[PDB]
Amino acid sequence: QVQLVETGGGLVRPGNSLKLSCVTSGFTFSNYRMHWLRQPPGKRLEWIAVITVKSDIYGANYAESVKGRFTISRDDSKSSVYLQMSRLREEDTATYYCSRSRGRTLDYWGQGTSVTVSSAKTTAPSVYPLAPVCGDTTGSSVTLGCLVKGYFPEPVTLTWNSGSLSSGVHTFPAVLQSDLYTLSSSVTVTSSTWPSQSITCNVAHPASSTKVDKKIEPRGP
Amino acid sequence: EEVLTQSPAIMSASPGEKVTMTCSVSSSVNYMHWYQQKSSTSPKLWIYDTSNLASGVPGRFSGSGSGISYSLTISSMEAEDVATYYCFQGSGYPLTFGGGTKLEIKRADAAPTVSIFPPSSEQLTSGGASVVCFLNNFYPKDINVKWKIDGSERQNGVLNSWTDQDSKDSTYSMSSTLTLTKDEYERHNSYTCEATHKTSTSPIVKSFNRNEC
């Protein structure tokens, strides 16, 4: 039951510093080398730093991309590894992971924590419910929509009926335009389920501390 | 550095088909490892030390190679194998990954279901007007969308977004959003989204007229 959990991610400005944490469960932390890696969106994974075990004094090693800007450290008593970042730039934007290794292999990773380095303003989304003009061409089925517009940074969390509606859903990757994102999502249900049962689009945007619910209303009787 | 190059960058295979992907290295390494990545989520160790499957990896997977050439093979493609596969050398600093092979699955061609949505009254209140069109559950991924406003093709103002292959049915979906001012939206009546897909010579056409709702 090895567990690794990164926290600390968030939006920061170019030149800022941010410290990431990785708390671990289910192995004897101090006996393993620990690493940070990252993946810019749409790009391959990148190894960026390793800290050896207390005894080595081989110390720490870094990718050149971060060397002399980032510092890896460990607290064995806390079973935790850290990445102190400084002098951040736009190309440091990525999901950051901590990993344990054995021999040549990185065996266990965390879930990732997301860091955005940007000068764009944090902006809460506008959330628009999309009511059908017609049932689907086959029967029998209807597609509803939710449009989420004008937010920054990623991510939003969208669900339908607080997550009870999971089947038949399509949530599209966000697209960036003029420092603002828009995303949409559709749900398809049997015509006998809607509008007789309520369907609601729920959008969380943690960066702007907002959570918006929007019921889909039928156009007519 | 040891530079890792994977071919092909992207591939598709029908279910039961034999899959091979390669990882070339700029200079010899002693062992190669492989990670499976679904949906840009946390990578899973797949194969370590060239040929050993990690715990729970199905026996249809195999790793081989030596020197500067490594491969991963799936004897019989399955739906659950849809992922991006990275090779990884951990023998010399900096530790490096290849650029991935994105592995998709083939299914039977499927026509999209097309749905169009007017600007919401809430959006109109704010001075803006988005018309939305979904092209859902189609295969193969290639697809054209066109917008017509009172019969006239509209190019500027459209933003498109495609999902990754669906995990329950192996189809793709696409959203197309036409953003206009409320004023221009209010200057016209017929809003039409047309989908052109290989499953038919005729486009799938969905419309509404603003002045009806």
Amino acid at position A60, single letter: A
B46 in contact with A at a CB cutoff of 8 Å?
Answer: no
A70 in contact with B at a CB cutoff of 8 Å?
Answer: no
The answer to whether A182 contacts B177, with C-beta atoms less than 8 Å apart, is: yes
Same domain (yes/no): B153, B80: no
Amino acid at position B88, single letter: F
Same domain (yes/no): B151, B167: yes
The distance of B39 to chain A (nearest Cα, Å) reads 11
Domain C-terminal end among B76, B91, B107: B107
Q: Where are the domains of chain A?
A: 1-119, 120-219
Residue B59 DSSP one-character state: T
Fold of A120-219: Immunoglobulin-like (2.60.40)
Cis peptide leading into A195, omega within 30 of 0? yes
Same domain (yes/no): B6, B97: yes
Same domain (yes/no): B115, B150: yes
The distance of B77 to chain A (nearest Cα, Å) reads 23
The answer to whether B132 contacts A110, with C-beta atoms less than 8 Å apart, is: no
Same domain (yes/no): B99, B7: yes
Residue B116 belongs to domain spanning: 108-213
Same domain (yes/no): B101, B114: no
Amino acid at position B1, single letter: E
> If you measure CA to CA, which chain B residue comes closest to A62?
B94
Same domain (yes/no): B33, B45: yes
Residue position matching structure tokens 């398809």: A188
Residue position matching structure tokens 């093979």: B73
The distance of B15 to chain A (nearest Cα, Å) reads 23
Fold of A1-119: Immunoglobulin-like (2.60.40)
Q: In this structure, are residues B179 and A180 in contact, taking their beta carbons and an 8 Å threshold?
A: no
Same domain (yes/no): B101, B112: no
What's the domain count of chain B? Answer: 2
> If you measure CA to CA, which chain A residue comes closest to B3?
A46
Of B204, B184, B3, B14, which is closest to residue B97 (Cα–Cα)? B3
The answer to whether B98 contacts A44, with C-beta atoms less than 8 Å apart, is: yes
Which string of DSSP letters, residue by residue, matches A95-163?
EEEEEEEETTEEEEE---EEEEE--SPPBPPEEEEE--SS--SSSSEEEEEEEEEEEBSS--EEEEGGG
Both tokens assigned to B173: 């979906």
State the CATH number of the domain containing residue B170: 2.60.40.10
User: Strand A210-215 relative to strand B96-97: parallel, antiparallel, unpaired?
Assistant: unpaired
Q: How far is the CA of B158 from the CAs of A131, B10, B131, B150, B213, in angstroms? A: 20, 27, 9, 16, 21
Both tokens assigned to A99: 């990993």
Q: How far is the CA of B187 from the CAs of A11, A21, B16, in angstroms? A: 40, 54, 54
Same domain (yes/no): B100, B114: no
Of A61, A106, A182, the CB nearest to B159: A182
Q: What element of type H or E holds B185? A: helix B182-185
Same domain (yes/no): B152, B61: no
What is the number of alpha carbons within 13 Å of residue B56 lying toward its C-beta?
A: 4
Both tokens assigned to A136: 């689907």
Is there a common fold for A1-119 and A120-219? Answer: yes
Nearest-angstrom CA–CA distance, A112 and A5? 7
Taking CB atoms and an 8 Å cutoff, what residues of chain A touch B134?
Answer: 143, 145, 170, 184, 186
Mutation target for A interface from B175, B192, B209: give the one with most A CBs within 10 A: B175
Same domain (yes/no): B113, B184: yes
Q: What is the CA radius of gyration of chain A?
A: 22
Mutation target for B interface from A186, A189, A217: give the one with most B CBs within 10 A: A186
Domain C-terminal end among B107, B131, B158: B107
The H-assigned helical ranges of B9-166 are 121-125
A126 in contact with B at a CB cutoff of 8 Å?
Answer: yes
Same domain (yes/no): B122, B103: no
Q: What element of type H or E holds A89? A: none
CB contacts under 8 A, A 163-182 vs B, are 167, 170-175, 177, 182
Residue B20: count of CB within 10 angstroms of its CB: 15
A72 in contact with B at a CB cutoff of 8 Å?
Answer: no
The structure's method of determination equals X-ray
Nearest-angstrom CA–CA distance, B154 and A159? 32
Q: How far is the CA of A166 from the CAs of B64, B68, B124, in angstroms? A: 39, 45, 29
